[PDB]
Design a protein around this motif. Structure first.
Motif, short mmCIF file in Angstrom:
data_model
loop_
_atom_site.label_atom_id
_atom_site.label_comp_id
_atom_site.label_asym_id
_atom_site.label_seq_id
_atom_site.Cartn_x
_atom_site.Cartn_y
_atom_site.Cartn_z
N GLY A 183 -43.85 -48.94 22.87
CA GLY A 183 -44.87 -47.91 23.14
C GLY A 183 -45.55 -47.55 21.85
O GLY A 183 -45.38 -48.25 20.83
N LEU A 184 -46.33 -46.47 21.89
CA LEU A 184 -47.03 -46.10 20.62
C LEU A 184 -46.16 -45.41 19.60
O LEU A 184 -45.31 -44.58 19.94
CB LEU A 184 -48.24 -45.20 20.94
N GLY A 185 -46.28 -45.83 18.33
CA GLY A 185 -45.42 -45.16 17.34
C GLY A 185 -45.74 -45.76 15.97
O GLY A 185 -46.80 -46.40 15.82
N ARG B 131 -54.39 -37.37 19.93
CA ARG B 131 -54.01 -37.73 18.57
C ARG B 131 -53.10 -38.94 18.62
O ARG B 131 -51.95 -38.85 18.23
CB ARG B 131 -53.40 -36.54 17.80
N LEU B 132 -53.64 -40.08 19.02
CA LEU B 132 -52.77 -41.24 19.10
C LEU B 132 -53.47 -42.48 18.55
O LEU B 132 -52.93 -43.64 18.68
CB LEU B 132 -52.18 -41.46 20.53
N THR B 133 -54.66 -42.31 17.91
CA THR B 133 -55.35 -43.52 17.42
C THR B 133 -54.58 -44.26 16.34
O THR B 133 -54.60 -45.51 16.30
CB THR B 133 -56.84 -43.28 16.98
N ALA B 134 -53.86 -43.52 15.47
CA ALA B 134 -53.18 -44.16 14.34
C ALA B 134 -51.93 -44.87 14.83
O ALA B 134 -51.43 -45.75 14.14
CB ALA B 134 -52.81 -43.06 13.35
N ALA B 135 -51.38 -44.40 15.95
CA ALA B 135 -50.11 -45.02 16.41
C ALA B 135 -50.38 -46.42 16.94
O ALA B 135 -51.47 -46.75 17.47
CB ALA B 135 -49.49 -44.15 17.54
N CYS B 136 -49.38 -47.29 16.81
CA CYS B 136 -49.59 -48.67 17.26
C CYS B 136 -48.55 -49.00 18.31
O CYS B 136 -47.43 -48.50 18.26
CB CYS B 136 -49.33 -49.65 16.13
K K Z 1 -53.42 -46.21 19.26
#
Ligand code: K
Ligand code: CL
Ligand code: K
Ligand code: K
Ligand code: K
Ligand code: K
Ligand code: K
Ligand code: MG
Ligand code: MG
Ligand code: MG
Ligand code: MG
Ligand code: MG
Ligand code: MG
Lengths: 1015, 204, 197
Positions: free
Chosen positions: A891-893, A901-906
Motif C-alpha cells: 500500500g502507500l508508505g 496528503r498522500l502524493t509523496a507516499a509510494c
Molecule cells: K502517492
C-alpha cells in the motif's frame, strides 16, 4: 537605581546614545585576514558566564548594583532568555497582547533582569581609536552602565544596539551593568505569535575601530542584458579625520584570485548646491562573465574594503561576501537574473526547545541542511531580523531570504491603530531603517518586508517609499491590510486558498488564481504564509503546487512554518516532555497553536515534511509508453549531480531496475526510453518508480541523496483464477446469545445481542480484546478543532459539528442478525442503525462469509443521513489481543499519509516496527493512517481489500481525551482501525474548516469489502 | 503650506535629510502641519520645506502626505526642483529663456524644462523675480511666457516684504537696519531686504 | 533631570508629554456660537503681560525660579521675540548656520528666556474636564512647569505645542514657568534665510 524618565513608556524614545546602524564589521588590520574572513583581534566576544539577578520591577533594583555585584546574583550563560533558566514564565499568546492594551504604558510589575559582567580590556585598546560594545539582541529594552556610569538605552529586540565605551573604560578590569525590562513601549510593536520571553539573548561583543574609520559601505551589482557583464559599485563612507592622503581600495576575489580592484580618494560627485559628500567615495569595478549567485548555485566573491593612506598604510579593512544577482519585477513577474523564481519557501522563527530564542550555529546549520534536503529554496524571517549568522549561512549555502522588520501590532483594534498614527512613525521607522542598514549587502536577502500583522497604516506607505528610495535593488512586500495594498510590490496573502474565495469584508482572501486577474491587477503573487502545518496537516498541499506550476504569476509561497515552538519541561522523575501554551502557568494562552512546524522542536520531521519535499521537487516527469520525459525546473544549473534510478515491481515484487544519468539543461527536457520491461504471467499491478539520486556529496547533502521521485501504474493483470476447492466445511452452532462457527483450528463467535464479531480463536488462542465494530469518528485533528474550546465553542468547527450531531455518542441499535449454513460456508448477515436522540445517523449492513479455506469475507454497505455532518471515517475497529513487532503492508508508505496528503507516499511492500505506525504529535489525535492499502499483515493476521488503516497501542478514545503525547500509555494489545473511507485532514489554515469538498465523505452510500485470514 | 524644515547650511544640502536618524524629527514637522491645516480650503498645495537638498526622508514624507491627504498636490524644490518628491516642477530663479546648467541641480530655462524627455508635470516657480533693491528687471518676460505656455502656471515672487528692523539714533529718530547692524557676525548684510514693499508696507 | 538630560541636543527627543496635533479647536458648548464663529468661554487667551528674565545658558537659571518670581525679572508683553526687547541681538545670516555645525550639539552659551505668569481658572475647570495650554509658537525649544512641577518639553518653532495641565491646576493662584532655549537640535532644521530670533 535612578530612573525618573521611564523611557520604556515613551515611543518617542527608542534609544539614547546609540551609534548608527551599519553592515557587519570586524575592523581587520590586515587585508588578507579580511579576505579570508578569519577572526579579527579587534572583534571580541563577551559571551560566557555573566552575573544575573531578577527583580519584579525596575523600582526594586538597588542602586548598589551599579557599582558592586549583588551577592544574591547567580552566574548564568549569556546569551540566554531568563525564562529558560526558570526565573519567570514564558507566555504563549498569539494575538492578544501579554499586557493590558494601554499604549504607551506597560504593567508596573515589569520583570527586570539585572545582568553584569566584569571583563578585561587591554591597554592597547585605550591608547588609540574607539572601543564600542554591541548587543545583538536584548528583549525588550535596556539601560547600560559601565564602571558605574550611565552609557545609554535601547529598544527593538531584534537588531544590534552599539555604544561607544571609549570614555568609560579603564585598562584591565571593567564592569558592565545592564538593566533589561521585559515590557516597554517597544512591546506594542512586538506582538508576534510566539513565546514571549526576555533577556540578553543574542551575542555581546566588543569592537575596536580606528578614529578614522569605515563607517558604512554599500555593495551593488548591476548587469548588462544577458548577464555576461557586471559593474560592482561600492559606496564607502568614513568618520574621523578626513585628509587628502586618504584612499579607499575595493578589491574583489574569487578564492585566492583577484578579479578586480579600484582605488580612489574621498570626495563624491556634486549632488546639490552645497556640493557633495567629502566623506564618501564610490568605487566601480568592471567584472566580465561573473559567476552569478542563486539558491541553486550560491556563487560568491569576496569584496575587501581597505581604508588606507595613499602611500600604503592600511588603517583598517572591512569585507563582505558578494553574490552577483539582479532581483527585479518586470511585467508582473519576480525575476532573479532574468528568470522567474518559483519560491519553495518556509517561514522560520528562531526557536530552540531548551534555549528558547537563543540561536546557535549548529542549530542554524541543521535547519538549513534539512531545508535544502527537503527542496526548500527560500525562507521568510517571520517576523523580525534574524541573528546575523543566519544571513551568512543563507548567502553561502543558498537560500532566498525575505528580511522582515520587527513590527507586529496584531492585538490592536483595529490592527492598524498604531501604524496609521504618526506618533508611532519614529519607532516604526527605526525598525525598518536599521534593518536595511544592517543587511543590505547580503545577496541572500532578495525582498524586504515591512513587518507582519499590523493592518495597513500611512506609516507603512512612508516606509515602503523610504526603502524604495534607499535600495532600488530589492522589492518591498507587506501583507497587512489585505495583501495587495499600496505598500507592497508583491501580492502576498496569508492562507488564501487555491480555488476557494473567502470574501471577508475589507480584507478578503481571494482564491490565489482569481486574485491575480482582478481588474487592474498586475503584480506577482507569492503567499507569505500558506499550508498551516499544525499537527496532522498539509492536506491539500499538492493543490497549491499544481497552481504554482500552471500560472506564471503564482510564484510560490512560504509554508507556515518550519519548527514547532514546543519547549522542554521535566516530570517528577526528571524525564523531558514537550510543553505548549499554558504549560508554564501562562494565562491567557493559546495552547497548542504554538506548534505549527514541518519538524518537531528537536528537528525530527513530521510526516508532512515528505509531502513538502515531493511537491517541491525540481524535476517533473511524464510517462508515454516506453518514454520517461524529465523536465528541469532549475533556472540556472544543468543536472550535473543527478542519476535517474528506475524500478518496476509487481505488487511489491521487484522485477527489473536500472539507472540512467540525467543530463538536462535548466528548464530543459530529456527523454529516457526504458528497456523492454517484464511482462509477468502472475496476477497483479506492475508499478514503475523513478528516483533522482545525487551521486556526489555537496555542501548540503550526502552522496546518494534522493531529491525527487514519482510512480506510475503500468500494466495490470487482474486475477481470474479460482481458489482451490477445499473439502472442509465450517460448522455453525446456535444459542439465543451467539452464533459460533468452527473450522479446523479456527473459531468465530458472533454476539446475537450486539450483532458483532465478539471473539475469534486461532488454535485455541483468543484474538480479540474488544469486538469488531463500525467506527464513524476520529480523535479530532488540530484542523478538526480549530479555535474551538470548552469555554468558547466554535459551532462551525468539524469537531463541534460531529459532537452536536451525536457522532461520538451514537449507540448501535441492532436491526438484523442472521446465520445461514451454505454449501461450503457459513453466512452471517447483520444490520445496525446509529442513532442519536431519535435521529438515525448511519446504517451499516454487512455480510460475513466464512468458507472452508478459513477465510472470512466481510462486505460492508453504509448509509449516512444526508443532513448529518459528513463523517470523519467509515471503517471498522477492534482491539487485537496480539502485540507484534512488525507491521507489513502492500500500500502507500512508508510514512503516514491521508487522502489529501498522500502524493509523496509510494505504493510498495513496506515493513516497519509497530512504533513507526504511530506519529507522536505533541497534541494527540488520529495519526499514522496509511492509505491505498491492498494487504496488511500483523502477527498471524492478514487483511486484504482496498482500505486505509492505522495500527497502534492507543485507542481513538485515549488519543481524543489526552492533551499531551507524554501522557499517553500503551493499552493492552493493539488497536486496529481499518477504514473503507477516511475524510481529508485539511490545513489551508487551522481555524476554519479547510477540508476540500472532494475529500469530504458526502456520497451518502459507501461500500467496502475486506477478507480476514490467517496467512 | 510649507513644513518648517530648512537645512541650507549643511554640506551637502541633504546631509540631514538623507539620514534616517533625522526622519523622526523631520516627520513631525510635516505630519503636525498637515494635522493642523488640512481643513483650510485656501491651502491648495503642501510643501515639504525649503533648501534641504533631496534626501530619502523627503520621499518618505512625500508618500505619507499622498497617503493621508490625496486632495492636494505635494511640492518640494530641493535637489533640482523636479525630483521624485514633487508633483510640480518648482524651481527657484530659473530664467525664462536662459539655461543655467549647474552640475546636478541645473536651472533650465522654464520653457525648456517643461519638455525635457519624459517630463509631463506643470511648472510653477516656488521663487522668481528677486526683488532686492532696485529690481524686477525682466518681470514682463516671465508673464509673457506664463500666458503663452499652458504648463507654465506662474510662480511666487521673492518676496513680499523687506526684513529690515527699526533702530533708533542718538536723537531717538528711527532708521531701517539690516544684517550686521546689531553687531551680529557673520551676517549677510542687505540680503534680508528683498521685498516688493518696505518693512512698513510702503510700496517699492 | 531637565538640565541633566539636555533634550535640546537630541533629535530623537522633539517633545515630552506633548498632546496630539489637530485642527483649530474652541470647545464650543453651544452650537449656534460655533456656527457663527463667536468666542468660546472654554478658550482663553493668556497673551499680555508676563514676567521675563534672560540668562546666558540654561545652567544659569536658578531653581528658585520654578517656585517664585525672580525679583530681577521684568514685565514684558507676550507674544514677543526677546531680541525686540533688547535682551540680546537678532542675527541676520542667510545660509551659514548661526551656530557651529556640529549636529546635534548647540553652543554651551545658549541664551535662555525665562518667562512666567500667575493665573487662575474658573471653578468649574478645577471640578472636571481637561484643561490644556497651547503655545502657538516658541522659538526654538522649551520646558514647561506649572506650580513648580515639570509638565513637558517641545520643539518646532512654528507649530503649536499643547500640554495637559489638568492634574497640575490648583485652587487660587497658579504659576507657569517656561524656559525657552534659543538654540536646540531643532535649529538644524530651521536654517531659513531670515533674522534669527
Ligand atoms: K502517492
Ligand atoms: Cl586583523
Ligand atoms: K509560476
Ligand atoms: K501559531
Ligand atoms: K487530544
Ligand atoms: K499658463
Ligand atoms: K534674502
Ligand atoms: Mg521608549
Ligand atoms: Mg594591496
Ligand atoms: Mg500575529
Ligand atoms: Mg505521484
Ligand atoms: Mg531634542
Ligand atoms: Mg535658504
Amino acid at each position: 537605581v535612578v530612573l525618573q524618565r521611564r523611557d520604556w513608556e515613551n515611543p518617542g524614545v527608542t534609544q539614547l546614545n546609540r551609534l548608527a546602524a551599519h553592515p557587519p564589521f570586524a575592523s581587520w588590520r590586515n587585508s588578507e585576514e579580511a579576505r579570508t574572513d578569519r577572526p579579527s583581534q579587534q572583534l571580541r566576544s563577551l559571551n560566557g558566564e555573566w552575573r544575573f539577578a531578577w527583580f519584579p520591577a525596575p523600582e526594586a533594583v538597588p542602586e548598589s548594583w551599579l557599582e558592586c555585584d549583588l551577592p544574591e546574583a547567580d552566574t548564568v550563560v549569556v546569551p540566554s532568555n531568563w525564562q529558560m533558566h526558570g526565573y519567570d514564565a514564558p507566555i504563549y499568546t498569539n494575538v492578544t497582547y501579554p499586557i493590558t492594551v494601554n499604549p504607551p504604558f506597560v504593567p508596573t510589575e515589569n520583570p527586570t533582569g539585572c545582568y553584569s559582567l566584569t571583563f578585561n580590556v587591554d591597554e592597547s585598546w585605550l591608547q588609540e581609536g574607539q572601543t564600542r560594545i554591541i548587543f545583538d539582541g536584548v528583549n525588550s529594552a535596556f539601560h547600560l552602565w559601565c564602571n558605574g556610569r550611565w552609557v545609554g538605552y535601547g529598544q527593538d529586540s531584534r537588531l544590534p544596539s552599539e555604544f561607544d565605551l571609549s570614555a568609560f573604560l579603564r585598562a584591565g578590569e571593567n564592569r558592565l551593568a545592564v538593566m533589561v525590562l521585559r515590557w516597554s513601549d517597544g512591546s506594542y510593536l512586538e506582538d508576534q505569535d510566539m513565546w514571549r520571553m526576555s533577556g540578553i539573548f543574542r551575542d555581546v561583543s566588543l569592537l575596536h575601530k580606528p578614529t578614522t574609520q569605515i563607517s558604512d559601505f554599500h555593495v551593488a551589482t548591476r548587469f548588462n542584458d544577458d548577464f555576461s557583464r557586471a559593474v560592482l559599485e561600492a559606496e564607502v563612507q568614513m568618520c574621523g579625520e578626513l585628509r587628502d592622503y586618504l584612499r579607499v581600495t575595493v578589491s574583489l576575489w574569487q578564492g585566492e584570485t583577484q578579479v578586480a580592484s579600484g582605488t580612489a580618494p574621498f570626495g563624491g560627485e556634486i549632488i546639490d548646491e552645497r556640493g557633495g559628500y567629502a566623506d564618501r567615495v564610490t568605487l566601480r569595478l568592471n567584472v566580465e562573465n561573473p559567476k552569478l549567485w542563486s539558491a541553486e548555485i550560491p556563487n560568491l566573491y569576496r569584496a575587501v574594503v581597505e581604508l588606507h593612506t595613499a602611500d600604503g598604510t592600511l588603517i583598517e579593512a572591512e569585507a563582505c561576501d558578494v553574490g552577483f544577482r539582479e532581483v527585479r519585477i518586470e511585467n508582473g513577474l519576480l525575476l532573479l537574473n532574468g528568470k522567474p523564481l518559483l519560491i519553495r519557501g518556509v517561514n522560520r522563527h528562531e526557536h530552540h526547545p531548551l534555549h528558547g530564542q537563543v540561536m546557535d550555529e549548529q542549530t542554524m546549520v541543521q535547519d538549513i541542511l534539512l531545508m535544502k534536503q527537503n527542496n526548500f529554496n527560500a525562507v521568510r524571517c517571520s517576523h523580525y531580523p534574524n541573528h546575523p549568522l543566519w544571513y551568512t549561512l543563507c548567502d553561502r549555502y543558498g537560500l532566498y531570504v525575505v528580511d522582515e522588520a520587527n513590527i507586529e501590532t496584531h492585538g490592536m483594534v483595529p490592527m492598524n491603530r498604531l501604524t496609521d498614527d504618526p506618533r508611532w512613525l519614529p519607532a516604526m521607522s527605526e525598525r525598518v531603517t536599521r534593518m536595511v542598514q544592517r543587511d543590505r549587502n547580503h545577496p541572500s536577502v532578495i525582498i524586504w518586508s515591512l513587518g507582519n500583522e499590523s493592518g495597513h497604516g500611512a506609516n507603512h506607505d512612508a516606509l515602503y517609499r523610504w526603502i524604495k528610495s534607499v535600495d532600488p535593488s530589492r522589492p518591498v512586500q507587506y501583507e497587512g491590510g489585505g495583501a495587495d495594498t499600496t505598500a507592497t510590490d508583491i501580492i502576498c496573502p496569508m492562507y488564501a486558498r487555491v480555488d476557494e474565495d473567502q470574501p471577508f469584508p475589507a480584507v478578503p482572501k481571494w482564491s490565489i488564481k482569481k486574485w491575480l486577474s482582478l481588474p487592474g491587477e498586475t503584480r506577482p503573487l507569492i503567499l507569505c504564509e500558506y499550508a498551516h502545518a499544525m499537527g496532522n496537516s498539509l492536506g491539500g498541499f499538492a493543490k497549491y503546487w499544481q497552481a504554482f506550476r500552471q500560472y506564471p504569476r503564482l510564484q510560490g509561497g512560504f509554508v507556515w512554518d518550519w519548527v514547532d515552538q514546543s519547549l522542554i519541561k521535566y516530570d517528577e522523575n526528571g524525564n523531558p516532555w514537550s510543553a505548549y501554551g499554558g504549560d508554564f502557568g501562562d494565562t491567557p494562552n493559546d495552547r497548542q497553536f504554538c506548534m505549527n512546524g514541518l519538524v518537531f522542536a528537536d528537528r525530527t520531521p513530521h510526516p508532512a515534511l515528505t509531502e513538502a519535499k515531493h511537491q517541491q521537487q525540481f524535476f517533473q516527469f511524464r510517462l508515454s509508453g516506453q518514454t520517461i520525459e524529465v523536465t528541469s525546473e532549475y533556472l540556472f544549473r544543468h543536472s550535473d549531480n543527478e542519476l535517474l534510478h528506475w524500478m518496476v515491481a509487481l505488487d511489491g515484487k521487484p522485477l527489473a531496475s536500472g539507472e540512467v544519468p540525467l543530463d538536462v539543461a535548466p528548464q530543459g527536457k530529456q527523454l529516457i526510453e526504458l528497456p523492454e520491461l517484464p511482462q509477468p504471467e502472475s496476477a497483479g499491478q506492475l508499478w514503475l518508480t523513478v528516483r533522482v539520486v545525487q551521486p556526489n556529496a555537496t555542501a548540503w547533502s550526502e552522496a546518494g541523496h534522493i531529491s525527487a521521485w514519482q510512480q506510475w501504474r503500468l500494466a495490470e493483470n487482474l486475477s481470474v483464477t479460482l481458489p482451490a476447492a477445499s473439502h472442509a466445511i465450517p460448522h455453525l452452532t446456535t444459542s439465543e446469545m451467539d452464533f459460533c462457527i468452527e473450522l479446523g483450528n479456527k473459531r468465530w463467535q458472533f454476539n446475537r445481542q450486539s450483532g458483532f464479531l465478539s471473539q475469534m480463536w486461532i488454535g485455541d488462542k483468543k484474538q480479540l480484546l474488544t469486538p469488531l465494530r463500525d467506527q464513524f469518528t476520529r480523535a479530532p485533528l488540530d484542523n478538526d478543532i480549530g479555535v474551538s474550546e470548552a469555554t468558547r465553542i466554535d459551532p462551525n468547527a468539524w469537531v463541534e459539528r460531529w459532537k452536536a450531531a451525536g457522532h461520538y455518542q451514537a449507540e448501535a441499535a441492532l436491526l438484523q442478525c442472521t446465520a445461514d449454513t451454505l454449501a461450503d460456508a457459513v453466512l452471517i448477515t447483520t444490520a445496525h442503525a446509529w442513532q442519536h436522540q431519535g435521529k438515525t445517523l448511519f446504517i451499516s449492513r454487512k455480510t460475513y462469509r466464512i468458507d472452508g479455506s478459513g477465510q472470512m469475507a466481510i462486505t460492508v454497505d453504509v448509509e449516512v443521513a444526508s443532513d448529518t455532518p459528513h463523517p470523519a471515517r467509515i471503517g471498522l475497529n477492534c482491539q487485537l489481543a496480539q502485540v507484534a513487532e512488525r507491521v507489513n503492508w502492500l500500500g502507500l508508505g512508508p510514512q503516514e499519509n491521508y487522502p489529501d496528503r498522500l502524493t509523496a507516499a509510494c505504493f510498495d511492500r513496506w515493513d516497519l516496527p509497530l512504533s513507526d505506525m504511530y506519529t507522536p504529535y505533541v497534541f494527540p489525535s488520529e495519526n499514522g493512517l496509511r492509505c491505498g492499502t491492498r494487504e496488511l499483515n500483523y502477527g498471524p493476521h492478514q487483511w486484504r481489500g482496498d482500505f486505509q488503516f492505522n495500527i497502534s497501542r492507543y485507542s481513538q478514545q485515549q488519543l481524543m481525551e489526552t492533551s499531551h503525547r507524554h501522557l499517553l500509555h500503551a493499552e493492552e494489545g493493539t488497536w486496529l482501525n481499518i477504514d473503507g473511507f477516511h475524510m481529508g485532514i485539511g490545513g489551508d489554515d487551522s481555524w476554519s474548516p479547510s477540508v476540500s469538498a472532494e475529500f469530504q465523505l458526502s456520497a451518502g452510500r459507501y461500500h467496502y469489502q475486506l477478507v480476514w485470514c490467517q496467512k
